[PDB]
Design a protein around this ligand. Structure first.
Ligand SMILES: CC(C)Cn1c(=O)n(C)c(=O)c2nc[nH]c21
Ligand SMILES: [Mg+2]
Ligand SMILES: [Zn+2]
Length: 519
């Protein structure tokens, strides 16, 4: 029934599937951080058994509990410290967690018929509320626990392959416009984020450089807010959007080029490496701090995404849709979580920076603005505000608009990647859409699923041919989306920012191919 993690000799075989005994709280924590390295949602309840030199290991139970509750909320944990109430709680949680469609229903609050659910499973409203109402004292204690983990956990060791060869490969992967996101593990992707954010931080003048371990801790925490079982809106998508923004900013001159940068965006990915394990560097619209703010916003722009759409949340009266009055439902959620859960604890000093010495506009506000701009329901207004701007805004609102436009472009950049990679994204987006349709049918009682089994997928094919064979008609989704959203956005942005014209070039190349096989 449950995965049991113990710091003591007690056994609870009545509810135990697999039991892990840990010598230290630090090693238990490391086990938990690695759970988001996989491609699947954790689908079993986790019981942690506590007792009735390391600072982590010697924390009072109140602080150990606070750490687990806050940093590992996503893992469906029940904490005990030495039968009927336990068994029923775990049994109920297991019944609700096993199946993907059940999990999405739980998180979104749309399958009530089927606080934390069973005291264990978090919902979007629970997490949103917890982070909005947290006291100053609680906030400072979490900051202390975070710094404690940075002090005592060597995060590079939590990646499966941190060899010199692999790290160099990732530098070159980051350098390709044909970013091979689907060939990178969630561990690989963590290092990719480090490469890009570290590179950006180094360009910011009045701003200290942050050690490898501290950046990695932050990124592990970000990864932990994405749902690994989302076929599309997962940490891979976050890093991909970050990487697209990264390329945009390099090509606009907001960041310098680096030795591993691949100049020609139309090339497919080739696996390259050398002896370097970080990016080696060689007026712009956005200055160094705005550039960093944008990249950070891209990283966090879908945090906590439950694998649905605004339309689903609105039409099925999801609690978060009710909170947000149907207005930018998921994006409001992402912005609130990213700021109040992640950045407030992990990087509070970034939130209080301003976009320039003269400006009162904070990086917090810029991040919020940019994240909110990714709502496709507001797509037309950002396009019109761009066309009005091209034909006036003060500096602050100019920075907001440019940032908004770049993050919008990055968010839907899968259609501007070279065909093969673009097709892989199309396929996983189709998987997620199919899950949403299944969830709707479950809620409407148009289908009865076996909730004792989980949804599993074969790997995304490497080659375009196999993708087209697995689902022909991929073309019509791409044609629809390019005609109604992408073409107009990238053309308009490239008119303002000529360096991004290559995006329009690739879109057309892809469109012509999709139109070809429509015939
Ligand atoms: C977020 C989503 C509804 C928008 N959307 C879409 O509908 N299709 C078909 C795509 O290929 C796509 N790529 C990014 N966003 C996309
Ligand atoms: Mg989004
Ligand atoms: Zn997104």
């Amino acid at each position: 029934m449950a995965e049991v993690l113990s710091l003591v000799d007690l056994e609870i075989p009545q509810v135990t599937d697999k039991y892990y005994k840990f010598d230290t709280f630090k090693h238990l924590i490391c086990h938990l951080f690695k759970k988001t390295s996989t491609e699947t949602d954790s689908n079993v309840p986790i019981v942690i058994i506590f007792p009735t030199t390391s600072k982590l290991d010697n924390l009072p139970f109140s602080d150990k509990s606070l750490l687990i509750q806050f940093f590992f909320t996503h893992l469906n944990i029940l904490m005990i410290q030495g039968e009927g109430k336990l068994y029923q709680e775990i049994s109920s949680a297991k019944e609700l967690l096993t199946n993907r469609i059940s999990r999405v229903g739980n998180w979104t609050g749309t399958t009530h018929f089927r606080s934390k659910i069973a005291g264990i499973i978090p919902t979007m409203t629970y997490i949103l509320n917890c982070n909005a109402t947290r006291s100053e004292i609680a906030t400072n204690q979490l900051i202390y626990l975070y710094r404690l983990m940075i002090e005592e956990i060597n995060f590079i060791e939590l990646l499966q392959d941190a060899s010199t060869t692999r790290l160099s490969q990732l530098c070159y992967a980051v350098g390709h416009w044909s970013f091979p996101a689907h060939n990178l593990s969630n561990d690989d992707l963590v290092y990719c984020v480090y490469l890009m954010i570290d590179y950006a931080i180094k360009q910011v003048e009045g701003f200290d450089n942050i050690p490898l371990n501290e950046l990695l801790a932050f990124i592990f925490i970000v990864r932990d807010t994405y749902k690994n079982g989302n076929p599309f809106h997962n940490f891979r998508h976050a890093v991909d959007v970050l990487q697209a923004c990264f390329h945009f900013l390099i090509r606009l001159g907001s960041l310098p080029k680096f030795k591993q940068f691949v100049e020609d965006p139309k090339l497919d990915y080739t696996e390259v490496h050398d002896k370097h394990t970080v990016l080696i560097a060689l007026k712009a619209s956005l200055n160094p701090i705005q550039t960093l703010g944008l990249l950070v916003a891209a990283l966090g722009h879908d945090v906590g995404h439950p694998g649905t759409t605004n339309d689903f949340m609105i039409k099925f009266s999801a609690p978060t849709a009710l909170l947000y009055n149907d207005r930018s439902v998921l994006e409001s959620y992402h912005a609130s979580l990213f700021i109040n859960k992640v950045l407030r604890i992990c990087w509070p000093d970034l939130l209080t920076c301003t976009i320039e010495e003269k400006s009162e506009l904070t990086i917090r506000s810029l991040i919020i603005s940019s994240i909110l701009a990714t709502d496709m329901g507001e797509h037309n207004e950002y396009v019109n505000r761009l066309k009005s701007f091209k034909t006036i805004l003060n500096h602050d609102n100019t920075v907001k608009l440019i940032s908004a436009l770049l993050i919008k472009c990055a968010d839907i950049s899968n259609v501007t990647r070279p065909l093969r990679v673009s097709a892989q994204w199309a396929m996983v987006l189709s998987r997620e859409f199919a899950e949403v349709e299944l969830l709707k049918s479950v809620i409407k009682k148009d289908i009865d699923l076996d909730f004792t089994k989980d949804l599993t997928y074969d790997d995304v094919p490497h080659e375009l041919r196999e993708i087209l064979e697995i689902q022909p008609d991929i073309h019509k989704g791409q044609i629809f989306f390019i005609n109604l959203f992408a073409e107009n956005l990238f053309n308009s942005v490239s008119d303002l920012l000529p360096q991004l014209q290559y995006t329009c070039d690739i879109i057309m190349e892809n469109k012509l191919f999709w139109l070809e096989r429509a015939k």
